[PDB]
RNA sequence: CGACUCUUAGCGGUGGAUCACUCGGCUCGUGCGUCGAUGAAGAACGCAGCUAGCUGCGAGAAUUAAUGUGAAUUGCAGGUUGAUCAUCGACACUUCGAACGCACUUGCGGCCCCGGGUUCCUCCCGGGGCUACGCCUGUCUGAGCGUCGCU
RNA sequence: GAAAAUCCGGGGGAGAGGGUGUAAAUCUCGCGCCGGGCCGUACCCAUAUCCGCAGCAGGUCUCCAAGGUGAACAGCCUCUGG
RNA sequence: CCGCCGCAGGUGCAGAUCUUGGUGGUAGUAGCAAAUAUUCAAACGAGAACUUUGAAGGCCGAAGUGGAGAAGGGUUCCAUGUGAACAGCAGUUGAACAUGGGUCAGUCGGUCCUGAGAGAUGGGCGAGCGCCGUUCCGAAGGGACGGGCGAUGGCCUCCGUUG
RNA sequence: AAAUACCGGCACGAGACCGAUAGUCAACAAGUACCGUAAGGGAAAGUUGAAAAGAACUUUGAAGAGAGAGUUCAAGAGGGCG
RNA sequence: CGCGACCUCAGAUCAGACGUGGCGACCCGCUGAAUUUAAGCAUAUUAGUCAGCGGAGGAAAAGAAACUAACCAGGAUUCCCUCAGUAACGGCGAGUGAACAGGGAAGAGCCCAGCGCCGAAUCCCCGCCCCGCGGCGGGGCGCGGGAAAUGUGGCGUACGGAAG
């Protein structure tokens, strides 16, 4: 909620950082094995656990 | 009403992040992870369950200690003198 | 994907096998000791007959004259080319050539399980004593070095199969008379052994 | 410009500090390029920045150190940081002079019949 | 802290602060509203620090 | 007549079988047989110029030093007195964790020291060194109509 | 038909206060001075931000509450708002 | 990669409501039917039954489709784009997508108190992990108001500061 | 002490074994994604080519998607592509 | 009433040290089922097995006879071959089931207490200095403290031992 702990906000921030795509260069390396970003996780698709 | 319309009563949580193993299965009644048992010294783990061992044991983690013990075996645990210099 | 597919029996994917292979498979076989002698006298006995040893398949066409027994220097060598010049003298270094032209590649999973390269038995050279005839003749393909007190028939008999074209020394070719004896005279090298 | 540190363990004391902190400000001039989005080359530059910091704040760690165990090696009793880091049940081992303790009565045993260097004729 | 904020922008910016208001923003890093004292000029100590 | 439908072949889609590989397994054998209050295993959270995951790592943060190695790193920018890799013995190793000042809210204390506020002279702010239980040997201050002792 | 933190008044009178002042000890009076760290704070709150595999006719705790008709927070109609 | 002679086996499939993966007929079929209802013009645009703006006609009708919060969510908030996929037609549109930006406290909560209760220590039990019990079988207070010799800051003046 | 045990741990060698529905659950960002309040459950997923030479430039369409060209022995190998 | 020894207890953020937790294939101490089998089932069997608990180590444990035997005797423990699917146990049903001797791998023996003698002949710690030690050790140094006659060290342990 609007009425967080320290630690649950914490969890949260590393979860927001954890949810952006590959960057464009990655994908041009000599041991290509990455398309995209599989981790890729939605608000509405899975619910973060807690 | 015991299936669809009482899921909507589901608003109030039990377990929190247990807080040795970072498992969200810290019981707050309880005040006892069903994960770890944090409040005791020992952690909980159980021979009935094989996969829930390999889960958590040495393997697991980084071995951030563990792992420069066996890099420092092989040269019997020395210390203190340094390479001879150039 | 798991979730309700089917995990254990012999048909289901993922699962074990039918009768999973055990190491506690009877894996040895012991022969009698009486046996093992029994197939060596047969082994050696087939190898100066020279029809069973073309049946065989070794070049020995060129090769002078005998069940081949050569002299006692050949047991001092030190170099493969004192030991490549010596087969070319005594004609057997077609069955190399043989064995050479035999380098193939192996059929199907052999290569990515470290049997990859298939080659031809040449001639075996057997030996009394070693000054160096191991050195001399391990780095040529096909020749595969015996002692004469310990002769196996896995060797003298490759495939299961009889007459390997055996290339013995002078002091190693006396031997066989003291190992195995004769019909009237025991085993001297044996407790109790007389031939069959 | 390229730091080493074979030239800053032959240097004094106070001197490091001040070689340190004006690379705090060259660093922090560097953190602010980076969020304004300017100069590319003040971007590569910041690593080399961040570990020479790292190489400055060693030496003082470093000579800091061999200093202490310089004036605490002729005591009984030292730091824990100064005491050898073997392994715990290696530190709880017998001393090398406590294993060489045999007894009075084995003094005497292995004293009177000293085990012999023999042979026999076959 | 707030103090520590207020000894940070002193000490490396030769500057006074009226107040400090710190906030965690939801990336996980806290930013500080260090509100100078009207002594000195805000928009000019930013030519100081370097930022436009 | 056609259209529709069936059969067959060609070509083309659909699908991923077969076959060929294989920096992975499994099995057997060998040597070694080393964790932790000097903070383990584990967990959290961080850190790259552009980096989400994976590894590597710990405010010195894809690493410092040292020895070896002797010219790269490389997806793209940028700048031989040793680049880069391996090794690693020096240093360093944030937060929870047996987890250790008392609590899990990262919430509240104490004592000694230092520094700003000053020019000891308190509140205040920041920093530092200590503060867990069980026990062991010695120490210290004690306690008892315990046992006696001398006046 | 809650405890406890917390706060205040009282009853006592151990004490303290100065020696006729440049008065003292003392004050819950009126100004003055300095300080207040730490964490949460966006937004949805439900016929589309929650829980029911989903923009699911389900479920899910409250606050404010206009005019008319009327016994009326009934129903219907309208204003702000949507 | 294969023939021959030997050796060895996880050695031959149509079935097991077999297992896994894929694809058919059904079939362009059932369906996109709960809570009254949309029409006109213009704009942006390659593109309009749906978007945006104005003008109509309507519904919710203050126990509301309104304005806010608790629990839960965790960036869904707000802007700027594109409009592949998703939003069971569409789309210039979105809570999708990608780049960014955004939560400021002595006073509002948390911190603090205790409630039903939870739970150490002593103790008791216990093969033991532990467990019981919470004032009960405990030497369970580390605080002050008082008196001299010493002592440190200050004209050791005489208090703060110490034992 | 020694002979003895060792499906964990460190570092190794080997196989009449398995060859991506097999072999460990895991040959790949695998105890990962995901599910359950929790204990626990737990996947799918290898291959362009010798070298990216990864299809310049022209032209239809709003773009997807094409037609020409061009690279290559081969695109009858066109970014999940033997 | 007081000061003193002592015994039995407290308290310390007293000076030093040490335990906790993990891993857990193997190893030691407990605890301990039921599937199953007996064509049912209850004793048995599964099985002193799985699970639960504590404890280690590089191996652990065992171990130098309160032994085996009955011979013409062998001689710690451990392991391997065998005895042996044997003696024996058992609704004598199902099923369970050792040991000695022998042949080998290795092979290693020993220490107290008690009984006694030696002026406690013994031991830990602090201070002082000295070479010096990333296993705090050897020597000197103090009518320095403590342990200890409710017994420390030497000799000595069943094979005998002490003293002259």
């Given at each position: 909620?609007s009425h967080?702990?320290f630690?649950?906000?914490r969890?949260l921030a ?6 952006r ?5 990655i994908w041009?390396?000599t ?5 995209y ?5 939605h608000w509405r ?6 | 009403t015991?299936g ?6 589901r608003?109030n949580?039990?377990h929190?992040?247990?807080?040795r193993c970072?498992?969200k ?8 992870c069903?994960?770890c ?5 020992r952690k ?12 958590n044991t040495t ?6 200690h ?9 040269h019997?645990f020395?210390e ?7 | 994907?798991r979730?309700?597919?089917g ?5 289901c994917?993922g699962?074990r096998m039918?009768?999973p292979?055990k190491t506690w498979?009877r894996?040895?076989?012991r022969v009698?000791?009486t046996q093992?002698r029994?197939?060596?006298c047969?082994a ?7 029809a069973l040893?073309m ?7 060129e090769?002078?004259?005998?069940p081949?027994?050569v002299e006692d ?8 080319k004192?030991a ?6 005594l ?5 190399i050539?043989?064995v050479?032209?035999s380098?193939?590649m ?10 990859r390269?298939?080659?031809?038995r ?7 004593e ?11 393909p ?12 896995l060797?003298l008999?490759?495939?299961?199969h ?9 002091s190693?070719?006396?031997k ?6 004769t ?5 001297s ?8 | 410009?390229?730091?080493?540190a074979r030239?800053?363990?032959?240097k004094?004391?106070?001197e ?19 969020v304004?989005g300017?100069?590319?080359?003040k ?15 060693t ?10 165990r310089?004036?605490?090696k ?9 005491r050898?880091?073997k ?6 081992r ?5 294993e ?15 085990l012999?260097?023999?042979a026999?004729?076959? | ?5 207020k000894?940070?922008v002193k000490?490396?910016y030769?500057?006074d602060?009226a107040?400090?208001n ?10 500080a ?5 009207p ?5 000019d ?5 370097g930022?436009?």
């Amino acid at each position: 909620s609007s009425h967080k702990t320290f630690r649950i906000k914490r969890f949260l921030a590393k979860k927001q950082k954890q949810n952006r795509p590959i960057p464009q260069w990655i994908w041009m390396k000599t041991g290509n094995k990455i398309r995209y970003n599989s981790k890729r996780r939605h608000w509405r698709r899975t619910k973060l656990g807690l | 009403t015991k299936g669809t319309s009482s899921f909507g009563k589901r608003r109030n949580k039990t377990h929190t992040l247990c807080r040795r193993c970072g498992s969200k299965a810290y019981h707050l009644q309880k005040s006892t992870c069903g994960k770890c048992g944090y409040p005791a010294k020992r952690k909980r783990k159980y021979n009935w369950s094989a996969k829930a061992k390999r889960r958590n044991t040495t393997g697991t983690g980084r071995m951030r200690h563990l792992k420069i013990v066996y890099r420092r075996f092989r040269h019997g645990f020395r210390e203190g003198t340094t390479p001879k210099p150039k | 994907h798991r979730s309700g597919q089917g995990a254990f029996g012999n048909m289901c994917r993922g699962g074990r096998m039918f009768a999973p292979t055990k190491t506690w498979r009877r894996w040895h076989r012991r022969v009698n000791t009486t046996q093992k002698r029994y197939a060596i006298c047969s082994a050696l006995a087939a190898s100066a007959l020279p029809a069973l040893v073309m049946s065989k398949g070794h070049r020995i066409e060129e090769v002078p004259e005998l069940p081949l027994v050569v002299e006692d220097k050949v047991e001092g060598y030190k170099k493969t080319k004192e030991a490549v010049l010596l087969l070319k003298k005594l004609k057997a270094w077609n069955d190399i050539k043989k064995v050479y032209a035999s380098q193939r590649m192996r059929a199907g999973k052999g290569k990515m399980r470290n049997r990859r390269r298939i080659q031809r038995r040449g001639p075996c050279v057997i030996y009394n004593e070693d000054n160096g005839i191991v050195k001399a003749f391990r780095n040529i393909p096909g020749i595969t070095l015996l002692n004469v007190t310990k002769l196996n028939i896995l060797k003298l008999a490759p495939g299961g199969h009889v007459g390997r074209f055996c290339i013995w020394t002078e002091s190693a070719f006396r031997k066989l008379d003291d190992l195995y004896g004769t019909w009237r005279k025991a085993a001297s090298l044996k407790s109790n052994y007389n031939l069959p | 410009a390229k730091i080493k540190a074979r030239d800053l363990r032959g240097k004094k004391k106070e001197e490091l500090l001040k070689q340190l902190d004006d690379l705090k400000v060259e660093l922090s001039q560097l953190r602010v390029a980076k969020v304004t989005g300017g100069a590319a080359s003040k971007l590569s530059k910041i690593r080399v920045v961040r570990k020479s910091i790292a190489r400055v704040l060693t030496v003082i760690n470093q000579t800091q150190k061999e200093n202490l165990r310089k004036f605490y090696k002729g005591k009984k009793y030292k730091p824990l940081d100064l005491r050898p880091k073997k392994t715990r049940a290696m530190r709880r081992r017998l001393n090398k002079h406590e294993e060489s303790l045999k007894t009075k009565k084995q003094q005497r045993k292995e004293r009177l019949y000293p085990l012999r260097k023999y042979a026999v004729k076959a | 802290n707030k103090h520590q904020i207020k000894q940070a922008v002193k000490k490396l910016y030769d500057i006074d602060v009226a107040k400090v208001n710190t906030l965690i923003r939801p990336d996980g890093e806290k930013k500080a509203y260090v509100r100078l004292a009207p002594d000195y000029d805000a928009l000019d100590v930013a030519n100081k620090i370097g930022i436009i």
